[PDB]
JSON list of C-alpha atoms and ligand atoms in Angstrom, two decimals:
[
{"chain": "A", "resi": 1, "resn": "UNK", "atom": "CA", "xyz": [-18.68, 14.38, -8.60]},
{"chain": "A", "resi": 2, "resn": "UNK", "atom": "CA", "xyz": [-19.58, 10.89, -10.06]},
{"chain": "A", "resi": 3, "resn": "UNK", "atom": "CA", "xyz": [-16.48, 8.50, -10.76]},
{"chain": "A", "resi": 4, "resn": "UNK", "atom": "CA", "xyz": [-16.34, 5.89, -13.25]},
{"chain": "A", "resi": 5, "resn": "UNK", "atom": "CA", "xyz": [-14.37, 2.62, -12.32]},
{"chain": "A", "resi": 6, "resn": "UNK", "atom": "CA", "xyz": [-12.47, 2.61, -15.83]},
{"chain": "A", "resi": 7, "resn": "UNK", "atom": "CA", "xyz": [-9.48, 3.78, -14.17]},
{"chain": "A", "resi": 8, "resn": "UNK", "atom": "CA", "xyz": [-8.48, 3.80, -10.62]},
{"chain": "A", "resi": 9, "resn": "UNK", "atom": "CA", "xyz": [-10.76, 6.03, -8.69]},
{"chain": "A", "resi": 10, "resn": "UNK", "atom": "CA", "xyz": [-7.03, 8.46, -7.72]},
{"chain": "A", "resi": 11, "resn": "UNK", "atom": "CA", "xyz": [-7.86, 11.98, -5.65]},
{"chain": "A", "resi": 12, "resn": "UNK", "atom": "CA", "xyz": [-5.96, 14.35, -4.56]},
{"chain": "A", "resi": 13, "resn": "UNK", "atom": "CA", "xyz": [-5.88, 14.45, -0.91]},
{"chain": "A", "resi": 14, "resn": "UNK", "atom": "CA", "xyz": [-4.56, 17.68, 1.37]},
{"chain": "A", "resi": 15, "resn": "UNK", "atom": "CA", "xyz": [-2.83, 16.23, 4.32]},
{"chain": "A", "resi": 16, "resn": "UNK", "atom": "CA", "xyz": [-0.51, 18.25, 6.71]},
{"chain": "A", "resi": 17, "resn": "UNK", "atom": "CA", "xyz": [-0.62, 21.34, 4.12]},
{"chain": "A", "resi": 18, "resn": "UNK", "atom": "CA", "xyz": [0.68, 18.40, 1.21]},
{"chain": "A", "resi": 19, "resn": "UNK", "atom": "CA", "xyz": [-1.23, 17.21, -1.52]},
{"chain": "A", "resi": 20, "resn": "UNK", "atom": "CA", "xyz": [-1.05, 13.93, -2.14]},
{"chain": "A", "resi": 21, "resn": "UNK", "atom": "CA", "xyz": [-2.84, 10.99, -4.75]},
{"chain": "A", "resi": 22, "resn": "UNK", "atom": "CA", "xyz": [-5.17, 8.27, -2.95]},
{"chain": "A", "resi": 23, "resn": "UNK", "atom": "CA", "xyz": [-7.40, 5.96, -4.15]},
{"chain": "A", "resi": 24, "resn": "UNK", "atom": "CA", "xyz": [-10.69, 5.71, -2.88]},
{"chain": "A", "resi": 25, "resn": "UNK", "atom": "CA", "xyz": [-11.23, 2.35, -2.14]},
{"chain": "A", "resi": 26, "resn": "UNK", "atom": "CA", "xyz": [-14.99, 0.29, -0.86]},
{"chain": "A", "resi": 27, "resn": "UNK", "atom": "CA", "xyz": [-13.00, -2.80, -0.42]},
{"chain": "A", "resi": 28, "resn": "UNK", "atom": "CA", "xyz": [-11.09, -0.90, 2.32]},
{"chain": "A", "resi": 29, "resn": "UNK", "atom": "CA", "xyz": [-12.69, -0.57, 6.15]},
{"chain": "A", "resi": 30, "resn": "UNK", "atom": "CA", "xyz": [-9.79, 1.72, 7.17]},
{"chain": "A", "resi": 31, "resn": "UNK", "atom": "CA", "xyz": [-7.69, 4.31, 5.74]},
{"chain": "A", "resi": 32, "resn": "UNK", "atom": "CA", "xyz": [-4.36, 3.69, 5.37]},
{"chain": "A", "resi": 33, "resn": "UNK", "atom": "CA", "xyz": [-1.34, 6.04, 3.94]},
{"chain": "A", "resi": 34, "resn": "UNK", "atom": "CA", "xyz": [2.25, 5.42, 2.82]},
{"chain": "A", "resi": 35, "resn": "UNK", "atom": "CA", "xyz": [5.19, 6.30, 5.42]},
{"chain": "A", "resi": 36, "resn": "UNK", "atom": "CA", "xyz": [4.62, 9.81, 6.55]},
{"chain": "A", "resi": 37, "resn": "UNK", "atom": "CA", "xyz": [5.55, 12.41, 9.38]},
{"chain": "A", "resi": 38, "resn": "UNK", "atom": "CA", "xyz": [2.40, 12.23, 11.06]},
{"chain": "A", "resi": 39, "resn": "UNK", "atom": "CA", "xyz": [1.47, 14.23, 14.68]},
{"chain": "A", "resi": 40, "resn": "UNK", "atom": "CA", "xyz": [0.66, 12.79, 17.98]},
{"chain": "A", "resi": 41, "resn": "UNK", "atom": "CA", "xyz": [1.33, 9.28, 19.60]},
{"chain": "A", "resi": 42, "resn": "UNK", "atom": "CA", "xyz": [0.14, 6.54, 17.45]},
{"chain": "A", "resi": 43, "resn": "UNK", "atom": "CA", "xyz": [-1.39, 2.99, 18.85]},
{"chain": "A", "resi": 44, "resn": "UNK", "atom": "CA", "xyz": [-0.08, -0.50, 17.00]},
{"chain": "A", "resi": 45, "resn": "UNK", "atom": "CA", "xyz": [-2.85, -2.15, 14.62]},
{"chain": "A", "resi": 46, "resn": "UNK", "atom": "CA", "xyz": [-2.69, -5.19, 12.60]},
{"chain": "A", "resi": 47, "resn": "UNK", "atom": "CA", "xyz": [-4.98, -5.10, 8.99]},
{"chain": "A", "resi": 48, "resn": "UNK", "atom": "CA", "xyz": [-5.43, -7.99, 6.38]},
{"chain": "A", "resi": 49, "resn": "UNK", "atom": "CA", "xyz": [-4.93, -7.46, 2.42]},
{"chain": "A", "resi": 50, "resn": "UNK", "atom": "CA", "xyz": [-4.88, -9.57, -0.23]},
{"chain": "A", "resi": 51, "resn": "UNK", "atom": "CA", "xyz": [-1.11, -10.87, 0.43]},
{"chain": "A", "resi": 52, "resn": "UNK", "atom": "CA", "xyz": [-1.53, -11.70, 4.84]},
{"chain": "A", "resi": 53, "resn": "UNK", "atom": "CA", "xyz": [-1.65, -8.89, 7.43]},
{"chain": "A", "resi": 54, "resn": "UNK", "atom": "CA", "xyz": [0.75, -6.07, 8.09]},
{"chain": "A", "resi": 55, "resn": "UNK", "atom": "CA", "xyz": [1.42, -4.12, 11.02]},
{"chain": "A", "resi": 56, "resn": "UNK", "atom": "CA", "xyz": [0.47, 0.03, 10.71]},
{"chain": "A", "resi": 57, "resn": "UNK", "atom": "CA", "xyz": [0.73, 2.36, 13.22]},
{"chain": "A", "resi": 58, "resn": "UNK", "atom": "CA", "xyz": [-2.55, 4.57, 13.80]},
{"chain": "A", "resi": 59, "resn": "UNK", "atom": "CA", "xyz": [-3.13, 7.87, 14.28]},
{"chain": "A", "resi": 60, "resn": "UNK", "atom": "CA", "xyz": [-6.67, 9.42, 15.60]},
{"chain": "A", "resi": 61, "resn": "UNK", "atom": "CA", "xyz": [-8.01, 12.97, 14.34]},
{"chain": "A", "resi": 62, "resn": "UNK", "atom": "CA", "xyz": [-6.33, 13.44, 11.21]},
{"chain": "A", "resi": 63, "resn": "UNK", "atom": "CA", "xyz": [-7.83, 16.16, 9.55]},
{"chain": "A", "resi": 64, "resn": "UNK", "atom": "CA", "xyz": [-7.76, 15.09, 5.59]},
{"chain": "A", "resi": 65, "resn": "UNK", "atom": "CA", "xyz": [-9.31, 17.34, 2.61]},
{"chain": "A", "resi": 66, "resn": "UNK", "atom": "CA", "xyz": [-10.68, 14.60, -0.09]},
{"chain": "A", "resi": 67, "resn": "UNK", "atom": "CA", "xyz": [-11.51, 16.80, -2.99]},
{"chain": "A", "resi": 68, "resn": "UNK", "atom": "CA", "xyz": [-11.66, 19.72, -0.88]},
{"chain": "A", "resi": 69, "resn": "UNK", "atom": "CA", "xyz": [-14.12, 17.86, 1.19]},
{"chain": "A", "resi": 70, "resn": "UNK", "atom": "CA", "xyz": [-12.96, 17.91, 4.89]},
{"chain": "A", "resi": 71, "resn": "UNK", "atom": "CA", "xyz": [-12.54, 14.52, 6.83]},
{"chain": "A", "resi": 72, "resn": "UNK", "atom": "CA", "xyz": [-11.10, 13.73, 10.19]},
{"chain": "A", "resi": 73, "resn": "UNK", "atom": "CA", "xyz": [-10.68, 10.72, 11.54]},
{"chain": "A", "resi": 74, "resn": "UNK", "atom": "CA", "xyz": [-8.37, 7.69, 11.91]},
{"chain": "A", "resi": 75, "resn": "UNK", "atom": "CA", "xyz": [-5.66, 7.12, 9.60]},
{"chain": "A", "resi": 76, "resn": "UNK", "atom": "CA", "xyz": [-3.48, 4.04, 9.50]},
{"chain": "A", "resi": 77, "resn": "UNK", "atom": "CA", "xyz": [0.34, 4.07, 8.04]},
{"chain": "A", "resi": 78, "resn": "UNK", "atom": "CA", "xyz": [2.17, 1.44, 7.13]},
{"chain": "A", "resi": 79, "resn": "UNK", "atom": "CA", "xyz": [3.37, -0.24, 3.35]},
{"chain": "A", "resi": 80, "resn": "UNK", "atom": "CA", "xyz": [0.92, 0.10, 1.08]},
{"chain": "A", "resi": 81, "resn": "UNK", "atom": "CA", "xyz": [1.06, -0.08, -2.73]},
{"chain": "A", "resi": 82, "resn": "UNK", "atom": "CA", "xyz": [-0.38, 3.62, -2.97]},
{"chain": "A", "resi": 83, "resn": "UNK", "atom": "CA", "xyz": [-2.27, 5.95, -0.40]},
{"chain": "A", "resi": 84, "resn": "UNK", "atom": "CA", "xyz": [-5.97, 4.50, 0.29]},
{"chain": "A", "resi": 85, "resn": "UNK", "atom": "CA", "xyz": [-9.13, 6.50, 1.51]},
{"chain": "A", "resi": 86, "resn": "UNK", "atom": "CA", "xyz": [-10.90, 3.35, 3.18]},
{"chain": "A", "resi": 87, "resn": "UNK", "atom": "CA", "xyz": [-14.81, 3.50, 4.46]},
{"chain": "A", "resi": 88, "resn": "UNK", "atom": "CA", "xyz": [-14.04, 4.98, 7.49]},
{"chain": "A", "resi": 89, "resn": "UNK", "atom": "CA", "xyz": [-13.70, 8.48, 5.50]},
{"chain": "A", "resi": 90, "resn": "UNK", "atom": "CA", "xyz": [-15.60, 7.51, 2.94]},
{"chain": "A", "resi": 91, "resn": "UNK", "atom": "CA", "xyz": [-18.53, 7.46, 5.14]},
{"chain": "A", "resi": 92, "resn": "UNK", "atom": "CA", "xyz": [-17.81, 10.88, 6.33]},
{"chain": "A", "resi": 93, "resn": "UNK", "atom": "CA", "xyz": [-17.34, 12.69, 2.82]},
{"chain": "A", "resi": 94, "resn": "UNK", "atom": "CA", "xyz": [-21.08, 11.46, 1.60]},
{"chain": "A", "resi": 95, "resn": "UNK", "atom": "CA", "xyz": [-19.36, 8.65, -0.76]},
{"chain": "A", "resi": 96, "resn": "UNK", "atom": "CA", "xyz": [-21.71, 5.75, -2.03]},
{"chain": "A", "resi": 97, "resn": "UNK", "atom": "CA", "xyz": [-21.90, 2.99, -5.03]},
{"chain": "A", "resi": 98, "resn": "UNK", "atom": "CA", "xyz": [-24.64, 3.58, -7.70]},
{"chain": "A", "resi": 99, "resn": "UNK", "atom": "CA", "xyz": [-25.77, 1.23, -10.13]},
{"chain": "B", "resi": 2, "resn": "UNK", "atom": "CA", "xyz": [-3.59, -4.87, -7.58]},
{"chain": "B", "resi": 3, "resn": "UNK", "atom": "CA", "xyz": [-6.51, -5.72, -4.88]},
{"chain": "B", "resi": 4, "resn": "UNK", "atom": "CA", "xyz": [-6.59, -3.25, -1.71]},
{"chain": "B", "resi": 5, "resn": "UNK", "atom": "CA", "xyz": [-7.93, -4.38, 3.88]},
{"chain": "B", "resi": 6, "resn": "UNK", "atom": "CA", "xyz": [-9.99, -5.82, 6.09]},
{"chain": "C", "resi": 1, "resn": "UNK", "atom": "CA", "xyz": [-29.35, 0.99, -6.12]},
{"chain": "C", "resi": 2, "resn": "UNK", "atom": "CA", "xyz": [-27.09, 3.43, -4.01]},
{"chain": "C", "resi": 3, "resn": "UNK", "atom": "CA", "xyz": [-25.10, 1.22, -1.41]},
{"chain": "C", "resi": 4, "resn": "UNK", "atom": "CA", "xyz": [-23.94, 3.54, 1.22]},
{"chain": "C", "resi": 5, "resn": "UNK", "atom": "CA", "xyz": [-20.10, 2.66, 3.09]},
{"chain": "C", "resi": 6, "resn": "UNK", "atom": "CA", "xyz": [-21.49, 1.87, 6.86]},
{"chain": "C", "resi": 7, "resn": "UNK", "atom": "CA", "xyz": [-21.08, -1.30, 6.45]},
{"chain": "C", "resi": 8, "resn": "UNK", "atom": "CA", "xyz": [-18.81, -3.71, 3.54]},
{"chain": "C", "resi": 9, "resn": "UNK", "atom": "CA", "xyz": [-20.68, -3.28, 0.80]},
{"chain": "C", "resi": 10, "resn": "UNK", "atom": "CA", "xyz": [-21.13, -7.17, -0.02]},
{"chain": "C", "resi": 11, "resn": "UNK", "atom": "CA", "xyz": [-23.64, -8.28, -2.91]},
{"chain": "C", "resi": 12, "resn": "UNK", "atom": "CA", "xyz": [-24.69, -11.86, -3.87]},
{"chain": "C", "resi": 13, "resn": "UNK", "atom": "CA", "xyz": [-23.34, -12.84, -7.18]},
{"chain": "C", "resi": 14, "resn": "UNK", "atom": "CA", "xyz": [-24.17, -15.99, -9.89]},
{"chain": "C", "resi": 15, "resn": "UNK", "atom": "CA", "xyz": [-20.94, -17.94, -10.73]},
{"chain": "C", "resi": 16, "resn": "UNK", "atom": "CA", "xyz": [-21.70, -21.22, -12.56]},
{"chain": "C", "resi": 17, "resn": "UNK", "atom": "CA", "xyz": [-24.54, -22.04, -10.64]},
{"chain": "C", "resi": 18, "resn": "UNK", "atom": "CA", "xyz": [-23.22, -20.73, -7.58]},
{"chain": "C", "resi": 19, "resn": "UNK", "atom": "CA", "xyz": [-24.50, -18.33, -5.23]},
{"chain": "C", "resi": 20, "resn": "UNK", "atom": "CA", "xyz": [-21.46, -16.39, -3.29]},
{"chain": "C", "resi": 21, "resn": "UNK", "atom": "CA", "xyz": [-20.94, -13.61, -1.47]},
{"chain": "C", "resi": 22, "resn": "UNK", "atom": "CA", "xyz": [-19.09, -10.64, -2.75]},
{"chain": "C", "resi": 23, "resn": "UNK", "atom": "CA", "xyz": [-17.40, -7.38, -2.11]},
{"chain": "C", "resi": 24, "resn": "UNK", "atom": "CA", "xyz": [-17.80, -4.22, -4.35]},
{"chain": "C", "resi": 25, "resn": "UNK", "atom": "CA", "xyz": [-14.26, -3.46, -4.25]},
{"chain": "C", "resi": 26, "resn": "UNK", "atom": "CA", "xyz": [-13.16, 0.25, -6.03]},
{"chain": "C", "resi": 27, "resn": "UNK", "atom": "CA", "xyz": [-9.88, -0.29, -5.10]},
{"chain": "C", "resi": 28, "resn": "UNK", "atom": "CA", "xyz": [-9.24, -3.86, -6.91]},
{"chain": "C", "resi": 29, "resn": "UNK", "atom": "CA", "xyz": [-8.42, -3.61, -10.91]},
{"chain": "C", "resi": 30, "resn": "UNK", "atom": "CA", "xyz": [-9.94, -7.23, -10.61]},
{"chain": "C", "resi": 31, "resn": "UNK", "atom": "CA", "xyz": [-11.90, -9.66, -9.81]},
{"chain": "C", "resi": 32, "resn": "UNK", "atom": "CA", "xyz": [-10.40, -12.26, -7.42]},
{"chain": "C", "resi": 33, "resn": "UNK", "atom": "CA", "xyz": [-12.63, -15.02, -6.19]},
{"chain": "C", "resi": 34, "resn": "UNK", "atom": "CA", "xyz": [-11.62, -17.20, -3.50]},
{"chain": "C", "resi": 35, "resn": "UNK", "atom": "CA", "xyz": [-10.49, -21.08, -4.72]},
{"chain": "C", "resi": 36, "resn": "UNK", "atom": "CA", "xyz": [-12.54, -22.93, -7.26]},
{"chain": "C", "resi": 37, "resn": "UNK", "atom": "CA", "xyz": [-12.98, -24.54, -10.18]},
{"chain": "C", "resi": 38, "resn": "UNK", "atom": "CA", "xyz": [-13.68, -23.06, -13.47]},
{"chain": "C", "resi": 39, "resn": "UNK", "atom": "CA", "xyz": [-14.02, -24.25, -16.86]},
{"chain": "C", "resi": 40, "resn": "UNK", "atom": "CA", "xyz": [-11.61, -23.48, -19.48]},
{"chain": "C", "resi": 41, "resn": "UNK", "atom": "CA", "xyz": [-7.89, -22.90, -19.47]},
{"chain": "C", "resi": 42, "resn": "UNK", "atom": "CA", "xyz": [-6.12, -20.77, -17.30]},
{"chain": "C", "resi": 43, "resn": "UNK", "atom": "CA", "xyz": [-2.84, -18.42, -16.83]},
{"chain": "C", "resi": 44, "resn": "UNK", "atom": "CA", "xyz": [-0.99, -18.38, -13.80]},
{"chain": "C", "resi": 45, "resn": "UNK", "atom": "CA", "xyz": [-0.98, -14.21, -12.58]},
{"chain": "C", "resi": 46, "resn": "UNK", "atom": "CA", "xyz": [0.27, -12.63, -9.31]},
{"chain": "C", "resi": 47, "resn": "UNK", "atom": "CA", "xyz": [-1.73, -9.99, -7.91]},
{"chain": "C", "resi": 48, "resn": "UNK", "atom": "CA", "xyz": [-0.31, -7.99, -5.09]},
{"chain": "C", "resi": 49, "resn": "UNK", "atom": "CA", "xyz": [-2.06, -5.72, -1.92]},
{"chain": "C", "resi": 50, "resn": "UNK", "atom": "CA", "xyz": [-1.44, -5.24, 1.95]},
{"chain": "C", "resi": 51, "resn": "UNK", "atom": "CA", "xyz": [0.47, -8.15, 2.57]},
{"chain": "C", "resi": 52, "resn": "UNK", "atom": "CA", "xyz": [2.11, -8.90, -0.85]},
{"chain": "C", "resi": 53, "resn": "UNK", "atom": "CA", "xyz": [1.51, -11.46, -4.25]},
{"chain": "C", "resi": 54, "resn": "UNK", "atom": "CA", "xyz": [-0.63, -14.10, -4.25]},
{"chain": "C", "resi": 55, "resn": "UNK", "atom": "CA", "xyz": [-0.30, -16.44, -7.03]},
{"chain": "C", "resi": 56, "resn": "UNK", "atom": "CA", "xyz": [-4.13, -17.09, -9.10]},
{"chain": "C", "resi": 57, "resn": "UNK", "atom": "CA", "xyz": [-4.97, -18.73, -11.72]},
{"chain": "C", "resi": 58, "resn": "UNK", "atom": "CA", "xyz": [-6.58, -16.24, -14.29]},
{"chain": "C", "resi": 59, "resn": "UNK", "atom": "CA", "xyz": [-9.54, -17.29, -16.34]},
{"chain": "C", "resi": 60, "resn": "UNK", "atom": "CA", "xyz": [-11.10, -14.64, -19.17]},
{"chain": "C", "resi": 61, "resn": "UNK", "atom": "CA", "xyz": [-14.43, -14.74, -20.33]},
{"chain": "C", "resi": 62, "resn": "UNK", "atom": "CA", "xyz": [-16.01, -16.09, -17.33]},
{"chain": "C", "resi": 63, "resn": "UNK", "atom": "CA", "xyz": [-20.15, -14.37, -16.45]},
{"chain": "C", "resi": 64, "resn": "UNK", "atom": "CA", "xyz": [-20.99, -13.56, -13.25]},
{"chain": "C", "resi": 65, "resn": "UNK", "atom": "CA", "xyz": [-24.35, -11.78, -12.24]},
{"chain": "C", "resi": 66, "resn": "UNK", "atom": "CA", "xyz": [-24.26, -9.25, -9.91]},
{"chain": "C", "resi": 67, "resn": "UNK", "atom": "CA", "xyz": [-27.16, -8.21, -8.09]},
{"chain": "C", "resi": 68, "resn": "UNK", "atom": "CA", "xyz": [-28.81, -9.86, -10.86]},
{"chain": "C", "resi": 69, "resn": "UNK", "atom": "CA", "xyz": [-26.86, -8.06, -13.91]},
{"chain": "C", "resi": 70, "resn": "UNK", "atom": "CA", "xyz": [-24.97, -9.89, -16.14]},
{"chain": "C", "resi": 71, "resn": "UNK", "atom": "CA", "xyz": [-21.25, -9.12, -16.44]},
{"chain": "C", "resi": 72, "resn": "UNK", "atom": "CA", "xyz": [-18.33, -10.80, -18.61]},
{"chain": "C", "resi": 73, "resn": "UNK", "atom": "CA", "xyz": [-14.62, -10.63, -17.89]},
{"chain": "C", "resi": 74, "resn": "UNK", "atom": "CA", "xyz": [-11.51, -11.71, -16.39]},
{"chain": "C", "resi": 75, "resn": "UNK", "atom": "CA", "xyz": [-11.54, -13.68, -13.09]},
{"chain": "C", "resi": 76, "resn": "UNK", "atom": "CA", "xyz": [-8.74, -14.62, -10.87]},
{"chain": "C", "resi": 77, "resn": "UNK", "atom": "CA", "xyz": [-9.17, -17.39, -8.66]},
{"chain": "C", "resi": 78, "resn": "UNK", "atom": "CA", "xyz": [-6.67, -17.83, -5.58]},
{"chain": "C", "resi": 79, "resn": "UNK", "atom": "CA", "xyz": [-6.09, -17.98, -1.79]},
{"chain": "C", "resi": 80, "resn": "UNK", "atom": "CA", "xyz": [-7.94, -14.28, -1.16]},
{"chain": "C", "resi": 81, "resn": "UNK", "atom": "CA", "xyz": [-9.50, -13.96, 2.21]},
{"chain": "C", "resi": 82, "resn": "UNK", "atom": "CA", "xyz": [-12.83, -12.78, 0.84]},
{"chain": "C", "resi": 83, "resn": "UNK", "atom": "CA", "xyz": [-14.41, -13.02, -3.16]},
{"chain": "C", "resi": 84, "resn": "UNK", "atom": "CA", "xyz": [-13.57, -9.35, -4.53]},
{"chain": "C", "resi": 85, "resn": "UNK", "atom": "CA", "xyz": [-15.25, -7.91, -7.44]},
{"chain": "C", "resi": 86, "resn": "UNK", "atom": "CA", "xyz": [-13.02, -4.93, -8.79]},
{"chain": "C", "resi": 87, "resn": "UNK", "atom": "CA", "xyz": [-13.05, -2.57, -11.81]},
{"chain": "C", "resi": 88, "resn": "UNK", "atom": "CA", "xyz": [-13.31, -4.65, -14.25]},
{"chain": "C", "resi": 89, "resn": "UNK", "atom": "CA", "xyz": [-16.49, -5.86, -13.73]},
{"chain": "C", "resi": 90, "resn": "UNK", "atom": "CA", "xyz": [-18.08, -2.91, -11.83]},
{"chain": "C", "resi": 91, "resn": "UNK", "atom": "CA", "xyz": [-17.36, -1.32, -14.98]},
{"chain": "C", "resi": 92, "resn": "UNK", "atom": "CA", "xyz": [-19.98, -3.85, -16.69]},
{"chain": "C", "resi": 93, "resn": "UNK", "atom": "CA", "xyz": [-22.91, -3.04, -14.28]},
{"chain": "C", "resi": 94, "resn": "UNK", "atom": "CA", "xyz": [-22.61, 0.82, -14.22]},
{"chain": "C", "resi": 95, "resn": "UNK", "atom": "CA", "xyz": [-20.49, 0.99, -11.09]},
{"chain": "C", "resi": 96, "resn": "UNK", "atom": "CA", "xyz": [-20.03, 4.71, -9.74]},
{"chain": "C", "resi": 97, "resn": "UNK", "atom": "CA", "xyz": [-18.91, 6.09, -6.81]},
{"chain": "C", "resi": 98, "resn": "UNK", "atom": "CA", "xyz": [-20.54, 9.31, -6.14]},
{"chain": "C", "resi": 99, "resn": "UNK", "atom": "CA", "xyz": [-20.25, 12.33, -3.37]},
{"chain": "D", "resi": 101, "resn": "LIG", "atom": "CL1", "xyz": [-12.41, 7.46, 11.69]},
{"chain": "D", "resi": 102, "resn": "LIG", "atom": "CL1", "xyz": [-11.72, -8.07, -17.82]}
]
């Protein structure tokens, strides 16, 4: 699909059999997803935002279906202001800018 | 809102 | 052109005579350079992320070039770790995110 920026670029995104709203977002490296059950061990990582940096615990291999595209990588959770589908996924669904 | 380095 | 997500997508934009450095952010409603001086009055504005509010000074009307297109809008100027283009702007130039 093509998205248009007039409104926040929000998917649905299938996580752990859920569905769940996420923005896809270019100014984001990593993928990172409000407080949620998650499986496996998860490592400590520290990210910057606008506001100062945060810490997020991270999870490796998380299978993720953006827009029924399949993705599975790392996924960071922690506080964020809504669910956000960073580069790192980005990357692996075929996403890129055009203008 | 802005979103992480 | 069709940036692709390897790497931050950063562009080189025209800001009253300045050349800066930019991010193509999706997930930013605006545009948030990093501390300046503009012409014209401003409006104090919080804008929140990872991390929290930052206080900016908001300034409407302002142009900017991106990749050498011409854009006009709202521009918040604060203590943000990198300049941020968001919506607003993309918006102007024709921004899409495809896949
Ligand atoms: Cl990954
Ligand atoms: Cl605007």
């Amino acid at each position: 699909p093509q998205i248009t920026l007039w409104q926040r670029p929000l998917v649905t995104i299938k996580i752990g059999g859920q569905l769940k709203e996420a923005l896809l977002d270019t100014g984001a490296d990593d993928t990172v997803l409000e407080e949620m059950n998650l499986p496996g061990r998860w490592k400590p990582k520290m990210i910057g935002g606008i506001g100062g940096f945060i810490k997020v615990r991270q999870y490796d291999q998380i299978l993720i279906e953006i827009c029924g595209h399949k993705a599975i990588g790392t996924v960071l959770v922690g506080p964020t202001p809504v669910n956000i589908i960073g580069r790192n996924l980005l990357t692996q669904i075929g996403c890129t800018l055009n203008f | 809102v802005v979103x992480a380095x």
